[PDB]
């Protein structure tokens, strides 16, 4: 074998492709795309209306049994009509496999809360709200979790500046900690690192 190249596992690539088709045949109403990566991970892309149907099927079906929610997060892409891509990472102790379920939304369209399916989603959805501003409908307790009280904006959005808009300080006159517009003694320096030469022709896009 090649000492420096990661080996391929064609067996697990064939098994995850069979199961991806299996899922898309059972939920045509919701599944829009199923893809398997070159390092054997399975992605089910769904319409946002199927968050509860699709997840419930994967948790409870006898051939899926994805009983553990590994993680739930969001990704921000400003160039899409629906900026926010919601990602569910799931685990199956019965079949020793993982699967990724993805949907989408925007600043104003809500998504159904997953707490009924996974009690683990309670805090993850608050974090997506706090950091991205995606509203989850029917959440038992939705509010900021990580940012400071009274914080304005959603810091993980691609257009929110790195250093924010305000900074804290102690003022002796008013005997408390105050908030003021941010001025930096040394401005963060921006490096343009990307090389002007194509790195990977396998991922080239049509012109």
């Amino acid at each position: 074998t090649r000492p420096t190249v990661r080996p391929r596992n064609d067996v697990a690539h064939k098994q995850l492709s069979a199961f991806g088709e299996y899922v898309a045949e059972i939920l045509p109403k919701y599944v829009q795309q199923v893809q398997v990566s070159c390092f054997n991970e399975l992605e089910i892309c769904i319409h946002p209306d199927g968050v509860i149907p699709v997840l419930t099927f994967l948790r409870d079906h006898s051939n899926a049994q994805f009983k553990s929610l590994a993680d739930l997060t969001a990704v921000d892409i400003p160039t899409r009509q629906n900026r926010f891509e919601i990602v569910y990472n799931l685990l199956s102790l019965r079949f020793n496999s993982r699967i990724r379920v993805k949907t989408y939304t925007d600043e104003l369209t809500p998504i159904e809360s997953s707490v009924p399916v996974y009690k683990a989603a309670n805090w993850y959805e608050r974090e997506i709200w706090d950091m991205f501003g995606v509203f989850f409908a029917n959440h038992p307790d939705l509010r900021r979790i990580l940012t400071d009280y009274g914080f304005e904006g959603h810091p993980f959005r691609k257009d929110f500046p790195l250093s924010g808009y305000v900074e804290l300080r102690y003022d002796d006159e008013v005997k408390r900690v105050v908030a003021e517009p941010v001025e930096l003694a040394q401005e963060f320096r921006k490096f343009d690192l990307n090389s002007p030469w194509e790195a990977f022709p396998a991922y080239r896009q049509p012109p």
């Binding site: 809500p110 509203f135 400071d148 009280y149 009274g150 006159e173």
Partner: protein, 116 residues
């Protein structure tokens, strides 16, 4: 179909305004308790005028979905004050007591710097 979207709480501006007013009543009746629990140095009248100013800024919204979010944030900001999750510093950040006034006219901006 492009303009057909899912609502948050209100299906039209008329229902949205109902939520705006209920929120305003909640804030109006809390200022006396807030000015007392946090031992603020402002008066109740100053507190109730700040609430009025905050509502006035977003008075030109005509999107029911946007208004729903503003109410959702308002209810979140309200729950923090009632339960004393905020502190005196957080409440007083609405007033900007330690920031010098910044001029609004062209000549004054010309003398100090380059910003428009």
């Amino acid at each position: 179909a492009s303009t057909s979207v899912k609502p948050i709480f209100s299906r039209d501006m008329n229902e949205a305004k109902r939520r705006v007013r209920e929120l305003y009543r909640a804030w109006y009746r809390e200022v006396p308790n807030t000015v007392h629990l946090f031992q603020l140095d402002i008066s109740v009248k100053q507190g109730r005028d700040k609430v009025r100013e905050m509502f006035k800024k977003n008075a030109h919204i005509t999107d029911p979905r946007v208004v729903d979010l503003l109410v959702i944030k308002g209810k979140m900001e309200l729950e923090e004050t009632i339960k004393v999750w905020k502190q005196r510093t957080h409440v007083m950040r609405f007033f900007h007591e330690t920031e010098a006034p910044r001029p609004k006219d062209f000549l004054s901006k010309f003398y100090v710097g380059h910003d428009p």
